Design an enzyme around this catalytic site. Structure first.
Site, PDB file in Angstrom:
ATOM      1  N   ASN A 161       0.820  -1.206   0.000  1.00 30.96           N
ATOM      2  CA  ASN A 161       0.000   0.000   0.000  1.00 30.96           C
ATOM      3  C   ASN A 161       0.855   1.257   0.000  1.00 30.96           C
ATOM      4  OD1 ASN A 161      -0.373   1.855   2.653  1.00 30.96           O
ATOM      5  ND2 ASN A 161       0.331  -0.191   3.279  1.00 30.96           N
ATOM      6  N   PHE A 200      -1.280   8.485   4.036  1.00 35.89           N
ATOM      7  CA  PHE A 200      -1.950   9.190   5.130  1.00 35.89           C
ATOM      8  C   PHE A 200      -3.209   9.927   4.659  1.00 35.89           C
ATOM      9  CE2 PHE A 200       0.699   7.805   8.200  1.00 35.89           C
ATOM     10  CZ  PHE A 200       1.779   8.555   8.628  1.00 35.89           C
ATOM     11  N   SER A 209       5.978   5.299   8.636  1.00 38.11           N
ATOM     12  CA  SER A 209       5.305   5.151   7.350  1.00 38.11           C
ATOM     13  C   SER A 209       6.315   5.319   6.218  1.00 38.11           C
ATOM     14  CB  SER A 209       4.203   6.192   7.180  1.00 38.11           C
ATOM     15  OG  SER A 209       3.674   6.121   5.864  1.00 38.11           O
ATOM     16  N   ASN A 230       5.497   5.956   3.257  1.00 33.89           N
ATOM     17  CA  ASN A 230       4.740   6.637   2.208  1.00 33.89           C
ATOM     18  C   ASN A 230       4.593   8.141   2.400  1.00 33.89           C
ATOM     19  OD1 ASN A 230       4.238   4.134   0.884  1.00 33.89           O
ATOM     20  ND2 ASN A 230       2.599   3.719   2.363  1.00 33.89           N
ATOM     21  N   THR A 231       5.356   8.701   3.329  1.00 33.66           N
ATOM     22  CA  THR A 231       5.453  10.151   3.461  1.00 33.66           C
ATOM     23  C   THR A 231       6.922  10.555   3.468  1.00 33.66           C
ATOM     24  OG1 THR A 231       3.364  10.422   4.675  1.00 33.66           O
ATOM     25  CG2 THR A 231       5.047  12.124   4.978  1.00 33.66           C
ATOM     26  N   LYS A 264       6.052   3.859  17.005  1.00 34.14           N
ATOM     27  CA  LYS A 264       5.961   2.764  16.049  1.00 34.14           C
ATOM     28  C   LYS A 264       7.104   2.860  15.052  1.00 34.14           C
ATOM     29  CE  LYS A 264       2.758   0.349  12.962  1.00 34.14           C
ATOM     30  NZ  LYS A 264       1.319   0.239  12.564  1.00 34.14           N
ATOM     31  N   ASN A 277       5.975  -1.409  11.514  1.00 33.02           N
ATOM     32  CA  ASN A 277       5.217  -0.948  10.358  1.00 33.02           C
ATOM     33  C   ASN A 277       5.530  -1.847   9.152  1.00 33.02           C
ATOM     34  OD1 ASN A 277       3.770   0.915   8.540  1.00 33.02           O
ATOM     35  ND2 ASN A 277       4.202   2.495  10.077  1.00 33.02           N
TER      36      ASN A 277
HETATM   37  C1  LIG Z   1      -3.645  -0.829   3.820  1.00 28.30           C
HETATM   38  C2  LIG Z   1      -2.745  -0.553   5.028  1.00 28.30           C
HETATM   39  C3  LIG Z   1      -2.769   0.706   5.624  1.00 28.30           C
HETATM   40  C4  LIG Z   1      -1.958   0.981   6.720  1.00 28.30           C
HETATM   41  N1  LIG Z   1      -2.038   2.222   7.364  1.00 28.30           N
HETATM   42  C5  LIG Z   1      -1.273   2.487   8.510  1.00 28.30           C
HETATM   43  C6  LIG Z   1      -1.368   3.713   9.158  1.00 28.30           C
HETATM   44  O1  LIG Z   1      -2.130   4.582   8.735  1.00 28.30           O
HETATM   45  N2  LIG Z   1      -0.601   3.965  10.303  1.00 28.30           N
HETATM   46  C7  LIG Z   1       0.269   2.987  10.802  1.00 28.30           C
HETATM   47  O2  LIG Z   1       0.934   3.200  11.814  1.00 28.30           O
HETATM   48  N3  LIG Z   1       0.364   1.756  10.142  1.00 28.30           N
HETATM   49  C8  LIG Z   1      -0.409   1.512   8.998  1.00 28.30           C
HETATM   50  N4  LIG Z   1      -0.311   0.276   8.345  1.00 28.30           N
HETATM   51  C9  LIG Z   1       0.622  -0.742   8.884  1.00 28.30           C
HETATM   52  C10 LIG Z   1      -0.078  -1.757   9.790  1.00 28.30           C
HETATM   53  O3  LIG Z   1      -0.572  -1.088  10.954  1.00 28.30           O
HETATM   54  C11 LIG Z   1       0.876  -2.870  10.229  1.00 28.30           C
HETATM   55  O4  LIG Z   1       1.955  -2.285  10.965  1.00 28.30           O
HETATM   56  C12 LIG Z   1       1.453  -3.645   9.040  1.00 28.30           C
HETATM   57  O5  LIG Z   1       0.451  -3.829   8.036  1.00 28.30           O
HETATM   58  C13 LIG Z   1       1.993  -5.005   9.486  1.00 28.30           C
HETATM   59  O6  LIG Z   1       0.943  -5.830  10.001  1.00 28.30           O
HETATM   60  P1  LIG Z   1       0.190  -6.895   9.056  1.00 28.30           P
HETATM   61  O7  LIG Z   1       1.139  -7.743   8.300  1.00 28.30           O
HETATM   62  O8  LIG Z   1      -0.751  -7.749  10.042  1.00 28.30           O
HETATM   63  O9  LIG Z   1      -0.804  -6.057   8.107  1.00 28.30           O
HETATM   64  C14 LIG Z   1      -1.107  -0.003   7.222  1.00 28.30           C
HETATM   65  C15 LIG Z   1      -1.087  -1.260   6.625  1.00 28.30           C
HETATM   66  C16 LIG Z   1      -1.904  -1.541   5.533  1.00 28.30           C
HETATM   67  C17 LIG Z   1      -1.885  -2.950   4.935  1.00 28.30           C
HETATM   68  O1  LIG Z   2       2.190   4.068   8.643  1.00 33.00           O
HETATM   69  C1  LIG Z   2       1.819   3.737   7.517  1.00 33.00           C
HETATM   70  C2  LIG Z   2       1.061   4.741   6.645  1.00 33.00           C
HETATM   71  C3  LIG Z   2       0.221   4.030   5.581  1.00 33.00           C
HETATM   72  C4  LIG Z   2      -0.225   5.048   4.528  1.00 33.00           C
HETATM   73  O2  LIG Z   2       0.381   5.036   3.433  1.00 33.00           O
HETATM   74  O3  LIG Z   2      -1.150   5.824   4.847  1.00 33.00           O
HETATM   75  N1  LIG Z   2       1.010   2.964   4.948  1.00 33.00           N
HETATM   76  C5  LIG Z   2       1.725   2.063   5.749  1.00 33.00           C
HETATM   77  O4  LIG Z   2       2.023   0.952   5.320  1.00 33.00           O
HETATM   78  N2  LIG Z   2       2.119   2.456   7.035  1.00 33.00           N
END
Ligand SMILES: Cc1cc2nc3c(=O)[nH]c(=O)nc-3n(C[C@H](O)[C@H](O)[C@H](O)COP(=O)(O)O)c2cc1C
Ligand SMILES: O=C1C[C@@H](C(=O)O)NC(=O)N1
Ligand SMILES: CN(Cc1cccnc1)c1ccc(NC(=O)C2CC2)c(C(=O)O)c1
Ligand SMILES: CCCCCCCCCCC[N+](C)(C)[O-]
Length: 363
Positions: A112, A116, A182, A184-185, A222, A251
């Site tokens: 992804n 944000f 993240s 992605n920023t 995190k 993350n």
């Molecule tokens: C679609 C998507 C969006 C995510 N958005 C955030 C986010 O906004 N903030 C954050 O700290 N982590 C975000 N993450 C990371 C997850 O919180 C997690 O740390 C990561 O996906 C690893 O766990 P998993 O393998 O069970 O998904 C995102 C992950 C995915 C897949």
């Molecule tokens: O913390 C984050 C932010 C998120 C996003 O792109 O909004 N994508 C991630 O995978 N981790």
């Protein structure tokens, strides 16, 4: 409610909807409570006391699924022992252009680059205020709420973005997460550096300490799975210097492990799911050792079974979260993980989750 049927249902929905559409729909269904309420009843074995709270079970929903705080109650109904919303940015922002989420079914992974997308602090604040007393009772009941804070793309002062988040949503959260990982920023992950991190977290903690006692959240950081050994040492050092309450590990990864099969493996973004699992577990193991087991860790990354959860707990996690497994196995996976975790704890001679935390380091 059948794990096997979802693991027919999910394959079919994924063939109909792109992942972002499926996500939005899932948030809607969850928020509306359309979803069997979980049959699995948590045993006392799964209860954990950390971060100043009771957690009826150690399995939470990771940030990113409920970015804007819309489905919190539905997520408790799904069986999660705690819920984390976010990331939330100070001002509303749209995130990256679509498509920005990609399935790697052959790898049980997702990539992804949302960037944000956020309704912003004010919207989320009022959304949480509308159920604030309901949450107070849930928390007292062992079902805590976490809020994950991000920063705006065009922000000139990163630390001030986080400080604003502390002031606005801190009063509504059992714990806050400073998301400095993240992928992605632009420039965000460099805030993990020792000097930037110390300055940032000193400001965050000062703001937190300035809140009234009953509205004063734990603060966690995190971190990424992609840190150098030097980065990890420095984070451990700062966390102990400042008295940070906990870490979330990890993350998504910007790495692409050898062996990925998905056609979309070379899309830009953070990789989650199975390919991340052991990278995350090893990062938990390292951070637990560097902090001498004195700093609570929430372990996240590639958890889709009781074994996955227990490996992170034994590596040093007090709690775990999952997200990506949900996209492949659906809601039944929550009860599956909890049931398998309980069975494994018994098999390996642990009286409960608490006994297993960090157990690998004592062997
Ligand atoms: C679609 C998507 C969006 C995510 N958005 C955030 C986010 O906004 N903030 C954050 O700290 N982590 C975000 N993450 C990371 C997850 O919180 C997690 O740390 C990561 O996906 C690893 O766990 P998993 O393998 O069970 O998904 C995102 C992950 C995915 C897949
Ligand atoms: O913390 C984050 C932010 C998120 C996003 O792109 O909004 N994508 C991630 O995978 N981790
Ligand atoms: C069907 N489902 C599980 C669910 C959760 C809550 C209520 N009902 C069902 C679900 C939820 C979110 C999904 N998408 C995502 O989250 C992707 C990463 C952006 C997907 C998917 O991509 O296939 C599937
Ligand atoms: C003004 C608000 C700008 C951000 C809109 C965000 C829409 C979020 C929709 C649900 C979450 N999801 C990641 C699936 O898009």
């Amino acid at each position: 409610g059948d794990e096997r049927f979802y693991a027919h249902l999910m394959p079919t929905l994924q063939g109909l909807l792109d992942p972002e559409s499926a996500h939005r729909l899932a948030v809607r269904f969850t928020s509306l409570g359309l979803l069997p309420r979980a049959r699995f009843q948590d045993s006392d074995m799964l209860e954990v006391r950390v971060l100043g709270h009771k957690f009826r079970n150690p399995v939470g929903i990771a940030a990113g699924f409920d970015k804007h705080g819309e489905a919190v109650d539905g997520l408790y109904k799904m069986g999660f022992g705690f819920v984390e919303i976010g990331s939330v940015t100070p001002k509303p922002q749209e995130g990256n252009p679509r498509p920005r989420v990609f399935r790697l079914p052959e790898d049980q992974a997702v990539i992804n680059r949302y960037g944000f997308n956020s309704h912003g602090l004010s919207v989320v604040e009022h959304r949480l205020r509308a159920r604030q007393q309901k949450q107070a009772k849930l928390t007292e009941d062992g079902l805590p709420l976490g809020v994950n804070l991000g920063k705006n793309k065009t922000s000139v002062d990163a630390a001030e973005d986080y400080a604003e988040g502390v002031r606005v949503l801190g009063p509504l959260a059992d714990y806050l997460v400073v998301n400095v990982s993240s992928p992605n920023t632009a420039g965000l992950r460099s805030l993990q550096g020792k000097a930037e991190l110390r300055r940032l977290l000193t400001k965050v903690l000062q703001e937190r300490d300035g809140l009234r006692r009953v509205h004063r959240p734990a603060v966690l950081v995190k971190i990424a799975p992609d840190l150098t050994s030097q980065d990890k040492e420095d984070i451990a050092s700062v966390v102990k210097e400042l008295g940070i309450d906990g870490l979330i590990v990890t993350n998504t990864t910007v790495s692409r492990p050898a062996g990925l099969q998905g056609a979309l493996r070379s899309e830009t973004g953070g990789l989650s799911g199975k390919p991340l699992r052991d990278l995350s577990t090893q990062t938990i193991r390292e951070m637990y050792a560097l902090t001498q087991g004195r700093v609570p860790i929430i372990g996240v990354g590639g958890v889709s079974s009781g074994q996955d959860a227990l490996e992170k707990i034994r590596a040093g996690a007090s709690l775990v979260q999952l997200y990506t497994a949900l996209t492949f196995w659906g809601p039944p996976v929550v009860g599956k993980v909890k049931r398998e975790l309980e069975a494994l704890l018994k098999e390996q001679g642990f009286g409960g989750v608490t006994d297993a935390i960090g157990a690998d380091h004592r062997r």
